[PDB]
A paper describes a structure:
Based on sequence analysis, we engineered a soluble construct of SMG6 TPR that spans residues 580–1166. We found that SMG6 TPR was a monomer in solution and had no propensity for self-interaction. We obtained crystals of human SMG6 TPR that diffracted to 2.1 Å resolution and used SAD to solve the structure. The model includes residues 580–1159, with the exception of disordered loops at residues 711–715, 823–878 and 955–963. The overall structure of SMG6 TPR is similar to that of SMG7 TPR and SMG5 TPR. SMG6 TPR features the typical 14–3–3 like domain (α-helices α1–α9, colored orange). It also has a C-terminal helical hairpins domain with seven α-helices (α10–α16, colored teal) that are stacked perpendicular to the 14–3–3-like domain. Additionally, the linker between the 14–3–3-like and the helical hairpins domain is longer in SMG6 than in SMG7 (68 residues in SMG6 as compared to 11 residues in SMG7). In the structure of human SMG6, an aspartic acid (Asp683) is present at the equivalent position and would be incompatible with the dimerization observed in SMG5–7 TPR. A detailed analysis indicates that the phosphoserine binding site in SMG6 is more similar to that of SMG5 than SMG7.
A well-known example is nonsense-mediated mRNA decay (NMD), which detects and degrades mRNA transcripts containing a premature termination codon (PTC) [reviewed in (3–6)]. In turn, phosphorylated UPF1 recruits SMG5, SMG6 and SMG7. These three proteins share a phosphoserine-binding domain similar to that found in 14–3–3 proteins. SMG6 is not part of the SMG5–SMG7 complex and has distinct functional modules: it contains two EJC-binding motifs or EBMs and harbors an endonuclease activity that cleaves the PTC-mRNA in proximity of the ribosome.
Author numbering: -581 to -580, 580 to 710, 714 to 822, 879 to 954, 964 to 993, 998 to 1159
Write the structure that this text describes.
């Protein structure tokens, strides 16, 4: 304990010297030598601490301080010198920056191995949060390891920029591996959002910044980042403002993403909401057409990002008009998804009471266009069970300029009706583990792991035989979840759906 405090005591004084050296407008070749000397002592000091007592280190923020003092400060000073016209040999300074980055990459590669050796674990045994199984020291060593991976990403990104290139592929891989370690940390999403802005992937950038805000450890800076992004979107939408079934999938898609971001800008910035109803109708109209294209121009992964942003807007909205309008938009897009899923199902039937078991729709017969949409339908339905008071009673604040409404509850009743003819028993699902069984995790639940709003929906483990087809198994689980969802809505106190006169129907208000 006293040895640790002794180590940090030395470090702070080392840092005081480094900070002062860096304050200078220029750094002599003698100044650069001393800096190298200071950084090396710093690293040895910090690393010893980490490898002596990881929990102490975490509590003293040694990782954060290591990065800030020995790397961030220095890197940023170098970037400034290279651009200073007062600097006579900028290319030589660039070269020292590259060198420092490469030595940086080695340092963190080495520290990652040491963490594993010192605290006795392999990283690959902890990359699946959804694995049901932590020693207090391994908990903290994983936390630190995640920080090392974020540092590797930042180093890789710095390297690209120092080289006037933009192959951000390595940086992204480091951030993705960091997110896997601990999905509740907002920082990996924030850094991934930055990569998206560099590459002008606007929707991904908004998605990831929102992930960063809706994490257990949020990155508040993401707020300002989004304001700036949405300001830029507002401009581009207003600029593009100076039939749908005729456009190509690609053109319609590009148009849709812009409308969608425009609507969410208004919701996020709370500016220009007086014309939210018109942008919302535009979003829904375009979304409705994109759903009819085969294969989906949008795709499951993007669809899930859309659902995520919709859920975020509903929570970020606090029951105000704005919160009702966010919920209305989400519910409407959810409804159009379900409707399309219904068409798809019945493209593959008698009346409910008259359904014969030999005519049931087998899950293994699901067409690929249906399979692409079900993960998003399931995740939104999870969200709804999590926040029943946002949609029951239904929001009433959104009135589209055409006054044509989307009937969520009738659409859900129809879905319930076609679903009764679906047989999901091809792969039996079990509540309890067994030697012949194994854990079924859905790809969409993995993706959204860490998203705080979804922490309120059930997480009940699900087991299937090791011999079962895992694709069919996953869809049988989705169908079971949606059937339970629809049952839950029928069993609600003041229910919006009911089985009535031989079929499921809407009993929601006019």
């Amino acid at each position: 304990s006293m040895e640790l405090h002794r180590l940090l005591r030395v470090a702070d004084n080392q840092e005081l010297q480094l900070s002062n050296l860096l304050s200078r407008d220029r750094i002599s070749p003698e100044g650069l030598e001393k800096m190298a000397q200071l950084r090396a002592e710093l690293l040895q000091l910090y690393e010893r601490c980490i490898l002596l007592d990881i929990e102490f280190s975490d509590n003293q923020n040694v990782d954060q301080i290591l990065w800030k003092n020995a790397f961030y400060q220095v890197i940023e000073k170098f970037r400034q010198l290279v651009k200073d016209p007062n600097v006579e040999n900028p290319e030589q300074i660039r070269n020292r920056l590259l060198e420092l980055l490469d030595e940086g990459s080695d340092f963190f590669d080495s520290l990652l191995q040491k963490l594993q050796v010192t605290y006795k674990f392999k990283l690959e045994d902890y990359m699946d949060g959804l694995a049901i199984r932590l020693r207090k020291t391994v908990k903290y060593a994983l936390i630190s390891a995640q920080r090392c991976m974020i540092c590797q990403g930042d180093i890789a990104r710095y390297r690209e920029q120092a080289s006037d290139t933009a192959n951000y592929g390595k940086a992204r891989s480091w951030y993705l591996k960091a997110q896997h370690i601990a999905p509740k940390n907002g920082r990996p999403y924030n850094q991934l959002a930055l990569l998206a802005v560099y590459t002008r992937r606007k929707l991904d950038a908004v998605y990831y910044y929102m992930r960063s805000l809706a994490a257990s450890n949020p990155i508040l800076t993401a707020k300002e980042s989004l304001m700036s992004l949405f300001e830029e979107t507002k401009r581009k939408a207003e600029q593009m403002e100076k039939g749908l079934g005729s456009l190509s999938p690609s053109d319609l898609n590009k148009r849709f993403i812009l409308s969608f971001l425009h609507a969410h800008g208004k919701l996020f910035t709370r500016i220009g909401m007086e014309t939210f109803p018109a942008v919302a109708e535009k979003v829904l109209k375009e979304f409705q057409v994109l759903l009819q294209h085969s294969p989906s121009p949008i795709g499951s992964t993007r669809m899930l990002q859309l659902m995520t942003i919709n859920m975020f807007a509903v929570h970020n909205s606090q029951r105000s008009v704005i919160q009702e309008q966010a919920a209305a938009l989400g519910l409407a897009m959810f409804s159009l998804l379900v409707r399309r899923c219904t068409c798809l199902l019945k493209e593959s039937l008698s009346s409910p009471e008259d359904q014969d078991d030999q005519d049931d729709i087998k899950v293994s017969s699901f067409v690929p266009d249906l399979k692409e949409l079900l993960p998003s339908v399931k995740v939104w339905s999870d969200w709804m069970l999590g926040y029943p008071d946002t949609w029951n009673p239904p929001p009433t604040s959104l009135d589209l300029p055409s006054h044509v409404a989307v009937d969520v509850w009738s659409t859900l009743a129809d879905f319930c009706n076609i679903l009764t003819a679906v047989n999901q028993s091809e792969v039996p699902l079990y509540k309890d583990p067994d030697d012949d069984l194994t854990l079924l995790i859905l790809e969409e639940d993995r993706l959204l792991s860490g998203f705080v709003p979804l922490l309120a929906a059930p997480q009940d483990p699900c087991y299937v035989e090791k011999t079962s087809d895992k694709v069919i198994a996953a869809d049988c689980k989705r169908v079971t979840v949606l059937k339970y969802f629809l049952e839950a809505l029928c069993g609600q106190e003041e229910p919006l759906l009911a089985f009535k006169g031989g079929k499921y129907v809407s009993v929601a208000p006019v």
